């Protein structure tokens, strides 16, 4: 069938939420890939089902080969060590560059999405080693990290949380760069509601911190925060699978935006049927760019210790 | 059952869409309210079959009497005369307060949505003869002016339509009110597309000239304009009964914003359970607000011709 | 892009609707043509700003010429005269033979679906003169009839009108076979519910016959019966598009089912990303036979009388 | 807000699915409760955010206090250990009462599912000492068993998953009772296409015994089969919140049904804005019932060694 062929490199937990969502939205046949055996199987199976409640018609399947990368059309990287941080850059390069050849020689055409932390640094590894052209690779960062600057900002107006819009760029991780002068709701600058006293600077600076830390929040919590991470992804996927060309925030290929070249950092882009239809740089005053700075300055310096042991 | 029920007062073409669109979305039982003899029935009979396709069960039932009203959660008026248009003015008057009284009588906590034209006059009058409270009752207006102005730009731009977000306030008519700077796309102020040289300046006066005249540039290609307005409605109608606490631009009693007091006028709402649970105030420059004022004084020079014949 | 491009040939009052529940399901660009100018174009214009309602993006323009249907991956066929009704056939059999040369020419692998009246005789004559294969044209009928058929008991059962699921075989039109024993409810023979007294034989006889004049009747409540054919339509579209693999009772070229060959009958069927993917017989009696036979010789009949004025 | 209120009592790894769904389908307000500190709230911050995504407003909170109960439309039942089986049942007995008490206290008129292993056992100790009518309370496990049995047979069959009707009754677990009789495949005998040789006999036993075996074969593939379980409560659960009045097989009081009283077991029921508005008794034949009554024996004696230690 023409249906669309979604690889899942990486059958963890963010795996098995990718999973149900794109049944729920009859995306397309899915395969779950793990090194891990069986595994696979077991949450293809059990997600199988869902079809059925659904009214969906998706494949999903396990796989512990990556020959099953053929014909993929879209594929989504999650796989590498996770347990210094920067020790496990060397393997997972290692971990970039197989996928990467696996990738050449299998789906050359495929449009991919990296998740592998810290993903600024580990898409550009696979960018490389998978020949992919420079539209067809991005890395989640802006989609999922403004969601939260979003949802929190919308429960103190309360507005529904789609209809606060905002900017994080430079990285995904902690020195992600929050533009308080792109926050908008209902497509008003936040400014007025600041000038209106419905939300407060202090408020919102507590908001950036919050956003900022997120992820060591849940974790605290002892929780796992992979379900915010799926769905963002399936939003990135979905809107280049639709040709729906919405702008996201992604990390994409600078080849000169806020004066980067050679390296990949978080920007709003428009995902549709041709990958990354552009490329949107953000008109930053200076002091906003230092920050921008700060972010590209630590993606490099991750980027240069994974390269060797 | 607590299924909402949803009387449509004015089973036209407009009408038709309205019903078709509230059982695609499964939103609650409709009933088509027409004056005319079985053409209700008959419309109310074929959409009901739709039921089917959609995986939905909402009722919809055709109505030639007012008490039906009862129990109405959503009340949606278009009846009026549509074939000077000032001559119509006392005719719609008549007909909004007959609607009114039966509203006051049949279903006093009901959410009203008018639509009758000229709508920023009609609503006002509805609101002062049914009763129901300010928060209450709205006019269709900016969003469906708004979904115009949206569309055209993201053709231009090559972006999802829903990215773009953007304000006419005022009336609804000829006299709305369009706000350039208002206009983002991705959430990104216009202006930083209009100095990329993505679209110009004049391009938008060109837009704005036509989202102002595409009621009738539509009715001069021989097709009559209610699709978009019956999809707008469903819009404002299904974030009140949801909850989703949207901001659409809507006509709303003014109490001082703007300057304006003892009118109605469209300006962003947020809409949710309590029906308008927040008027917005854009903070315009008097260049803005001297449009605003030509709009409300059209209002109420329309407002005076309807009382009397 | 890749998305589909859906042309409907034809842009009267069934095309409006089939145009808005494309861009609610974003399930593809589409095309209004229609011999008439500029109505077309007005309706694409009212129906592409619902893309901003809808989260759509799903391009809608008008056509008055032929080689739009070019790259069309799904065409519609409405087109015809409509006002003995036998005096038609011939005028609407040279419409069919105009339409199939140009699908030859500029979309011969495009998936077909014809509803132009009497739709069984149609389909055939827009098969002969397009040259498609036999398992990429179908026709309107029992998804359309059986949406009465299972509504109608859903509502005297109160169930949820999707868990009826019924069968009527033959032809669209008054000669529709409908099967009392391929009726079920929630997956169970209706009969246990008559067994039950839940419903009975009398009242199913009442509701077979009011299945039977749908039409008939909603013409004479004085509206026109077109909004459940056009969702009809959407959901046999829509599971070609989405390789849904749904079992929808459609026309189709018969091979020899039900002793039936060189003419199109109403089965069900199963639509897929290959078409007609396969063609379902129902293991008819010799009574229910006898009804299909009568079905078929009434298309026969009416076929005879398309070829010449 | 009139948003509905869905109280999740556990919140495991079935819990997490559970309110990413509720979100996903915009369908209330959650609070995921656990014994367990913190957790909840980090799973229910992470979920949070995707209202961002799923252009929804459903408030996700956490809880450790029982008396969050007050207020809830919908209740789901998942907590109670896990890790003889039969040794857990008076441990079990106890949360279901404790639970039951809060639910007595606090949300007398909420709408209970329960899930706790063994659910036709636990269902009936919860309604015991809920003191909620016999049409508030229903077990999990139709809905659930029959998406195995449905899907296995769509894809031998290549049709639309959904398209599959299917029953197994009596009990949720390895006495499950499936009925080859009552297989339907877009609404046609499933013996229609055993006598075609689409399906045989022994292929249908194989996939009967692989339905029984589902959740160990996925066990035994080193994954947790929580997926369809949250995915068929959430049916369960949309079914009465928007009053679809869908027929879903579920564990409910037997009054008399299948000769049986006093006990709860798995039937065709359907669900609506009433809770169970119908019991739907199939019209088993002998052999039949001999496998219904084994599974009721069942279910009776693990009920008499959940009372006492
Ligand atoms: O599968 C998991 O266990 C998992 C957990 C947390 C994650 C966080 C991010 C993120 O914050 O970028 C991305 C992917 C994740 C995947
Ligand atoms: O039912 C109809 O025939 C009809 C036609 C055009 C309309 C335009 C507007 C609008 O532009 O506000 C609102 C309602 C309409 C209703
Ligand atoms: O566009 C219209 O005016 C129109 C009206 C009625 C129709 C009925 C059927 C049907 O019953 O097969 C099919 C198409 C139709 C199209
Ligand atoms: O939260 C979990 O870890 C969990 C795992 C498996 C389950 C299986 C069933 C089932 O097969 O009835 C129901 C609930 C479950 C919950």
Redesign the interface.
């Known amino acids: 069938?023409?249906?669309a062929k979604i690889v899942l490199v990486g059958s963890g937990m963010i795996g098995?939420?990718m999973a149900?969502?794109i049944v729920?939205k009859?995306l397309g046949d899915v395969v779950l890939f793990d090194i891990?055996?069986?595994?696979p199987?077991?949450?293809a199976?059990?997600?199988?089902?869902?079809?059925?409640?659904?009214?969906?018609?998706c494949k999903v399947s396990g796989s512990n080969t990556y020959d099953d990368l053929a014909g993929a059309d879209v594929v989504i990287v999650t796989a590498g060590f996770t347990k210094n941080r920067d020790d496990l850059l060397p393997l997972n390069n290692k971990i970039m560059i197989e996928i990467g050849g696996h990738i050449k020689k299998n789906c050359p055409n495929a449009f991919i999405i990296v998740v592998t932390n810290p993903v600024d640094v580990m898409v550009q590894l696979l960018h490389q080693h998978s020949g992919v052209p420079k539209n067809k690779i991005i890395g989640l960062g802006g989609?999922?990290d403004?969601?939260?600057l979003?949802?929190y900002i919308?429960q103190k107006l309360?507005?529904?949380?789609?209809?606060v819009?905002?900017?994080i760029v430079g990285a995904h991780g902690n020195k992600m760069v929050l533009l308080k002068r792109?926050?908008?709701?209902?497509?008003?600058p936040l400014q007025?509601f600041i000038?209106?006293k419905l939300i407060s600077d202090a408020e919102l600076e507590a908001i950036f911190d919050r956003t900022v830390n997120?992820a060591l929040?849940?974790?605290?919590?002892?929780?796992?925060?992979?379900?915010?991470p799926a769905?963002?992804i399936?939003?990135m996927a979905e809107?280049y699978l639709?040709?729906?060309?919405?702008?996201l925030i992604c990390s994409t290929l600078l080849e000169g935006q806020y004066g980067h070249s050679d390296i990949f950092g978080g920007t709003?882009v428009?995902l549709?049927?041709?990958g990354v239809?552009?490329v949107?740089?953000?008109?930053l005053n200076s002091e906003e760019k230092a920050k921008f700075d700060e972010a590209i300055a630590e993606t490099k310096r991750m980027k240069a210790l994974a390269h060797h042991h």
């Not at 891990?36 to 595994?39: R, W």
């Not at 929040?217 to 915010?228: G, K, M, R």
């Open positions: 069938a023409p249906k098995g939420v149900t969502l729920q009859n891990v055996k069986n595994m199987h077991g949450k199976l059990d997600t199988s089902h869902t079809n059925v409640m659904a009214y969906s018609n989609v999922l403004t969601s939260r979003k949802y919308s309360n507005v529904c949380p789609r209809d819009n905002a900017h792109y926050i908008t709701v209902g497509g008003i007025e000038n209106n997120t929040e849940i974790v605290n919590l002892h929780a796992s925060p992979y379900v915010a769905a963002a399936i939003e809107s639709k040709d729906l060309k919405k702008v709003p428009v549709g049927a041709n239809e552009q949107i740089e953000l008109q």
